[PDB]
C-alpha cells in the first residue's frame, strides 16, 4: 500500500539500464506527491535517490520486504544521466489502472466535477483557512457528483478515504485512476469546520479525438441520429485549415450515411486515403476533402 510510504523509507530499484541486464540499485524516499513534469498528466510521483537511468522505465520500486511500492517512470537529468532524482508511479495508482485494463482494455475515467487550484499559504490567509496545503474548490459543476454530495465552492479538501492530501494535483491523480462509480469519501474544510462527504464517480468533444491529429474543433451528436454537428471552432487550427466551421452538420462521409459519431468513426476505421465529408452549412450542402 503506497499510502503507507513515508519520506525516509528505504527503496530498491530494479530495471534494465542501457540494456545491461537486470540491475539493482538502492536509495530512500526523497519526497512524495511530486508532480509538474507534465501538467496534463495524472502524476503523484514518489521521488527517490535510487539510481535510475535509461532502461529502468517500467521497472519495479520495492521496499525492504520486496513489495512493489511504485513503478519507476522518469528522472530529472540535464545530461541524460542519473543525478539522484528519480520518480515512480505509486503502487496504488498502478493497482487501480491495471485492474481496469484487465477487464475493459482501457480505463473508465470518472470525475467529481469540481474546479480548483493549489492551496498555498497566501490563499489560506485570504480565505481565513488554517491548512497551508490541499485542494481549493473554485467551483462545483451543476449536476455533478460533488454538487449532489453537498460540496460548495470555497471549500478545502484535506483528505481522501482517510488518507491526507498532499495537493490538488495529487488528488486529481488519485481519482483520475479510479473507475467510474467508485464510492469514496472526502474530508473537507469550510469555515474552519471539519466536514465528511460520501461521493460516487460519474461519467465525463474535440475533433482530435476522432481524426487523431485534427485539433481546434469541438463536435457532438445532433438530436437523434441527425448527424454530427460542430459545436465550436478555434482559429489557426488544423481543422479550420480544411474549411470546417462551427454550425456544420455532417450528414455522411465517402457515400456512407452518418447519423452519429459511431457511424463516422466506422468510416475512419476503414482508413481511406481521402476523406470526403458531406456536411451542410445553413441551407446548402457542401463537401470537405481530407488528404
Amino acid at each position: 500500500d503506497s499510502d503507507a510510504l513515508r519520506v525516509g523509507d528505504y527503496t530498491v530499484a530494479i530495471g534494465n539500464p542501457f540494456g545491461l541486464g537486470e540491475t539493482v540499485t538502492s536509495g530512500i524516499v526523497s519526497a512524495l506527491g511530486r508532480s509538474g513534469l507534465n501538467a496534463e498528466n495524472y502524476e503523484n510521483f514518489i521521488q527517490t535517490d535510487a539510481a535510475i537511468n535509461r532502461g529502468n522505465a517500467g521497472g519495479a520500486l520495492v521496499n525492504l520486504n520486496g513489495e512493489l511500492i511504485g513503478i519507476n517512470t522518469a528522472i530529472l537529468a540535464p545530461d541524460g544521466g542519473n543525478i539522484g532524482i528519480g520518480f515512480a508511479i505509486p503502487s496504488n495508482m498502478v493497482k487501480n489502472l491495471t485492474s481496469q485494463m484487465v477487464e475493459y482494455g482501457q480505463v473508465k475515467r470518472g470525475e467529481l466535477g469540481i474546479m480548483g487550484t493549489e492551496l498555498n499559504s497566501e490563499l489560506a490567509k485570504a480565505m481565513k483557512v488554517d491548512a497551508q496545503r490541499g485542494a481549493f474548490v473554485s467551483q462545483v459543476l451543476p449536476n455533478s457528483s460533488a454538487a449532489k454530495a453537498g460540496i460548495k465552492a470555497g471549500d478545502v479538501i484535506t483528505s481522501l478515504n482517510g488518507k491526507p492530501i498532499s495537493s490538488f494535483a495529487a488528488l486529481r491523480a488519485q481519482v483520475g485512476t479510479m473507475p467510474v462509480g467508485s464510492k469514496l469519501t472526502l474530508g473537507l474544510l469550510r469555515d474552519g469546520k471539519q466536514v465528511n462527504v460520501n461521493l460516487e464517480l460519474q461519467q465525463s468533444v474535440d475533433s482530435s479525438s476522432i481524426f487523431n491529429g485534427i485539433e481546434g474543433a469541438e463536435m457532438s451528436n445532433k438530436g437523434k441520429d441527425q448527424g454530427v454537428v460542430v459545436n465550436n471552432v478555434k482559429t489557426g487550427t488544423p481543422a479550420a485549415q480544411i474549411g470546417l466551421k462551427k454550425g456544420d452538420v455532417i450528414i455522411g462521409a465517402n457515400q456512407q450515411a452518418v447519423k452519429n459519431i459511431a457511424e463516422l468513426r466506422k468510416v475512419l476505421d476503414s482508413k481511406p486515403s481521402v476523406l470526403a465529408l458531406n456536411i451542410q452549412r445553413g441551407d446548402s450542402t457542401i463537401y470537405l476533402l481530407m488528404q
Binding site: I75, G86, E111, I114, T117
Partner: peptide
C-alpha cells in the same frame, strides 16, 4: 530537464 527513462478539473 525532465526526461522519460490555472484552475484544473477533478
Amino acid at each position: 530537464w525532465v526526461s522519460a527513462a490555472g484552475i484544473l478539473q477533478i
